[PDB]
């Protein structure tokens, strides 16, 4: 089973380089993740890490005026980003993620699911078991849909609307990797040996 | 309304830089697209052109062994790609797009809808009316969902599974823009004055 | 020996995908290039192709007002490149190469030598003998220097000034590779098998 | 005048984000840099900062086995970089910069000059006075040439050899900017406001 409330709990359990650790605590609390073969666990974290962090801090910033707020309480600010020459990207985060999350009032539950769908990426290269990873993705989204239809009955197209925030998350995610400024927001790509302390 | 059969007919009307022309014919036949402010029509094609083209050829290549097949009948081939130093990206198209479309046997109707959802991108910068473009996207996906419930009732999660092919389409789309080789598959970014004969 | 007039002849013999052909005829005519092991001949052209061609068209454009002029007589134009969304990079070619070439009135002979320095790139990965390639670059620059002291004795720092046009040519060279527009000016990266008809 | 020993002293005065401070102290000690309009001083530093820091750490690493050595005593290590997925670029620094500096035994004085040449980049966008910036460059290189003919009379082509390390320094420089990893080596692009404490 892939119970929504257990994803909700996972999000809560971690509600505020240390980023990585709190990422790993989160992932372990997602149903079944830990039952994946260990190398696949590494791969899925090395692949999704930046999307996962961006999605979290975007949600966190829903109430923040101006910029974004990190879990470490680092408060970034739009102009600080513009001065670092990453304004276009930064505004993208604000407009395509933070704003959209705000206007539809995204649940902590819905966030968890989106990040779980991101986590369970069957397209990540090197997986011993792509098909197992695809099935967990499927169990996350089915559960998310039920959740939306039960909790938000007056909004028939809310599910899809959450889904369609993922291409944006994907663009932003790639672009962030290309400007050193963003190291201050999401660190660099996690190293194998280190992640392997998910063991 | 946003009737799927009219999207299906749009796809068929164009079934085999001439690429741009046939893209434009396609877009015209999507319900309401032409009712958009003309500058918005231009932005939406400039933004989506490459995803729209890759999505098209990927679906066309469902049957093809080895590589991908273009509407001009140029048949590319995996080795040609690897020779050109774009193998990683090329294999991403085959793995994340072509193969997934093949395994799920994507409808020409489902292709049309995904492509229309891509066309009606509310995040495209410069739109005089994002709000209106958002609503058309919403009319497309709702209409695609009923269609999947109608036509594939034994596959509860098929709608989401189609949607979740869009972040892949988005990464592949951006990576393609970074290798000269791909000019031979999708040309370069269309220029406004030129698109402006959607008038 | 590495006699400058033989490089000058090389330049002239080719003075106006066919691009690659005329690049190959050019390199053959550079003293000693053909004495290089044939795999190193391939590597050097595959590495330097884009800078070699940009350098060529930049010099040919010294006279042209507005934009740049290709050997095929394609005349690009500054607006056309800005409409294509590659204005910044195009402007760099005009400002950092074309203009500097014009102000200093670069020789055909000095063009030949710079391009031969670029062709004998000892840093090219996979060379069977980087040391031999280094020595040919050495024979080109020493030969260039004598020629500058002989022909422009009024200008003590002209040699260096020509050399320092190379970091820019390396910048522009890389940036060109990331925008499909430039396929129209330099093609894509040459493929091994094809170049191998240097045999 | 542009006396080489004053550049030598500049290098020495700084011999071991704090990075930027020591960069600023360095620049100030370069003859005439401080005479430049203040806005131009910020531009040249914002433009050259990465090349300047890379070239410094490269030279510092001449003796180090294995990897690179930072002024802060951070000792990076080849496989450390390979694990972070930046092995190709890292190898480039080692082969194209550190190795070549080693084999030719580059002087601290020759380092100073090369870095001065890089600092005095007349191609930097936004300069109020690119002509004045060009002249200081010229005074550095002429001065570097006499120094090389005085100090290394047995090596006629040493000057050109040093110069020809600059395109490499430019390639590496750009590529470094595209991987979050390197924020650990060079921080990100310096901000206007902050550099303006050159005042």
- Three-state secondary structure of C13-67: HCCCCHHHHHHHHHHHCCCCHHHCCHHHHHHHHHHHHHHHHHHHHHHHCCCCCCC
CA distance D132 to D36: 8
Helix axes C18-28, C38-60, angle to 10 degrees: 110
CA D90 to chain C, closest CA, distance in angstroms equals: 14
Counting one residue from A and one from D, how many pairs have CB atoms under 8 Å apart? Answer: 45
Residue A116's contacts (CB-CB under 8 Å, 6 or more residues apart) are: A7, A30, A140
Q: How far is B199 from chain A (nearest CA, A)?
A: 30
Resolution in A, one decimal? Answer: 2.8
Contact D186 A180 (CB under 8 A): yes
CA distances from A154 to A81, A148, A151, B126 (A): 38, 10, 9, 31
Coil/strand/helix, residue A75: strand
Spatial separation of the C-alpha atoms in residues C118 and C140, rounded to whole Å: 10
- Identify whether the C-beta of residue D163 lies closer than 8 Å to the C-beta of residue C164: yes
Cα–Cα distance measured from residue C83 to residue B192, given in angstroms and rounded to the nearest whole number: 7
Instruction: Point out the residue among A138, A157, A170 whose CB comes nearest to the CB of B167.
Output: A170
CB pairs under 8 A between A and B: 52
CA distance C73 to chain D (A): 29
Percent of chain B that is helix, strand, coil (3-state, to 5): 65, 0, 35
With vertex at residue D182, the alpha carbon angle to CA D176 and CA D185, rounded to the nearest 5 degrees, is: 115
Asked if D167 contacts C166 with a C-beta cutoff of 8 angstroms, the reply is yes
Contact residues, chain C, for B190 at CB < 8 Å: none
> What's the CA gap between D172 and D166, in Å, rounded?
10
Are residues C142 and D160, on separate chains, in Cβ contact within 8 Å?
Answer: yes
Note whether B157 contacts A163, CB cutoff 8 Å: no
Which sequence spans correspond to the domains of chain D? 1-199
Gap between the Cα atoms of D54 and A98, Å rounded: 36
Which chain B residues are closer than 8 Å to C173 by Cβ?
Answer: none
| Contact by Cβ (8 Å): D52, D68 | no
Cβ neighbours for D114, distance < 8 A, ≥ 6 positions apart: D55, D144, D162, D163, D165, D166, D169
User: Distance from first CA to last CA of chain C, Å, rounded?
Assistant: 23
Instruction: Phi first, then psi: give them for residue D135, nearest 5 degrees.
Output: -65, -40
Q: Are D164 and C134 in contact, with CB atoms under 8 Å apart?
A: no
Question: What is the rounded end-to-end Cα distance, in angstroms, of chain A?
Answer: 23
A123 and B156 within 8 Å at the Cβ level: the answer is: no
Phi, psi of B82 (to 5 degrees): -65, -40
Contact C174 D171 (CB under 8 A): yes
Residue of D nearest to C165 (CA): D167
Instruction: Pick from B50, B139, B160 the residue to mutate for testing the A interface (most A CBs within 10 Å).
Output: B160
Among partner residues D178, D184, D193, which is closest to A178 by beta-carbon distance? D178
Which conformational region is residue A77 in: left (phi greater than 0), alpha (psi within -120 to 50 degrees), or beta? left
Q: How many residues does chain A have?
A: 199
Residue C155 DSSP SS3: coil
Q: What angle do CA B84, B88, B91 make, to 5 degrees?
A: 100
Instruction: Print burial letters for A74-83: b (CB count within 10 Å at least 16), e (below 16).
Output: eebeeebbeb
For residue D153, give every residue at least 6 positions away whose Cβ sits within 8 Å of its Cβ, in sequence order, or none: none
CB A42 within 8 A of CB A192: yes
**CB D163 to CB C160 under 8 A?**
yes
- How determined? X-ray
Q: What is the CA radius of gyration of chain C?
A: 16
DSSP structure string for chain D: ---HHHHHHHHHHT---HHHHHHHHHHHTSTTGGGS-HHHHHHHHHHHHHHHHHHHHHHHTTS-SSS-B-TT--B--HHHHHHTT-HHHHHHIIIIIIHHHHHTT--HHHHHHHHHHHHS-TT-TT-S-HHHHHHHHHHHHHHHHHHHHHH-TT-TTHHHHHHTTHHHHHHHHHHHTT-GGGHHHH-SPPPHHHHTTT-
Cα–Cα dist D65/C179, whole Å: 39
Selected for mutation to probe chain C from B180, B185, B194 (highest C CB count within 10 Å) is B180
What region, left, alpha or beta, does residue D121 occupy, with left being phi > 0 and alpha being psi -120 to 50 degrees? beta
Per-state percent for chain A, helix, strand, coil, to nearest 5:
65, 0, 35
Determine which of D95, D167, D178 to mutate to test the interface with C (most C C-beta atoms within 10 Å).
D167
Show the 3-state SS of A80-142. HHHHCCCHHHHHHHHHHHHHHHHHCCCCHHHHHHHHHHHHCCCCCCCCCCHHHHHHHHHHHHH
Residues in chain B with CB shorter than 8 Å from the CB of C76 are: none
Distance CA A45, CA A26 (A): 11
- Spatial separation of the C-alpha atoms in residues A126 and C184, rounded to whole Å: 36
Within 13 Å of residue B182, how many CA atoms lie on the same side as its CB? 26
Options 3.30.9.10, 1.10.565.10, 3.30.930.10, 3.30.300.30; CATH of C1-199: 1.10.565.10
Report the C-alpha dihedral over residues D142, D146, D147, D151, rounded to 10 degrees: 160
C-alpha D123 chain-centroid distance:
16
C164:D168 CB<8 A:
no
Distance (Å) of CA A190 to CA A23, A145, A197, B122, D84: 11, 31, 12, 33, 7
Across the interface, whether the CB atoms of D187 and A180 are under 8 A apart is answered yes
- Contacts with B112 (C-beta within 8 Å, 6 or more apart), sequence order: B4, B7, B8, B10, B11
3-class DSSP state of A18: helix
Mutation pick from A164, A166, A175 vs chain B, by most beta carbons of B within 10 Å, is A164
DSSP-derived 3-state class of residue C151: helix
C75: helix, coil or strand? strand
């Amino acid at each position: 089973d892939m119970p929504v409330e257990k994803i909700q709990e996972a999000e809560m359990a971690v509600e505020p380089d240390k980023q990585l650790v709190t990422l790993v605590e989160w992932a372990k609390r997602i149903p079944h993740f830990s039952d994946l073969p260990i190398d696949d666990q590494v791969i899925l974290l090395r692949a999704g890490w930046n999307e996962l962090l961006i999605a979290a801090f975007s949600h966190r910033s829903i109430d923040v005026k101006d910029g974004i707020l990190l879990a470490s309480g680092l408060h970034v600010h739009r102009s600080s980003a513009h001065q670092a020459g990453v304004g276009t990207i930064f505004d993208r985060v604000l407009t395509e993620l933070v704003a959209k999350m705000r206007d539809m009032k995204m649940d902590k539950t819905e966030l968890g699911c989106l990040r779980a769908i991101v986590l369970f990426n069957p397209d990540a290269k090197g997986l011993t078991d792509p098909s197992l990873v695809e099935s967990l993705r499927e169990k996350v989204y089915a559960s998310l849909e039920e959740y939306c239809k039960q909790q938000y009955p007056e909004q028939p197209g809310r599910f899809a609307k959450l889904l369609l925030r993922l291409p944006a998350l994907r663009s932003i995610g790639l672009k962030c990797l290309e400007h050193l400024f963003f190291f201050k927001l999401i660190g660099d790509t996690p190293i194998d040996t280190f992640l392997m302390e998910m063991l």
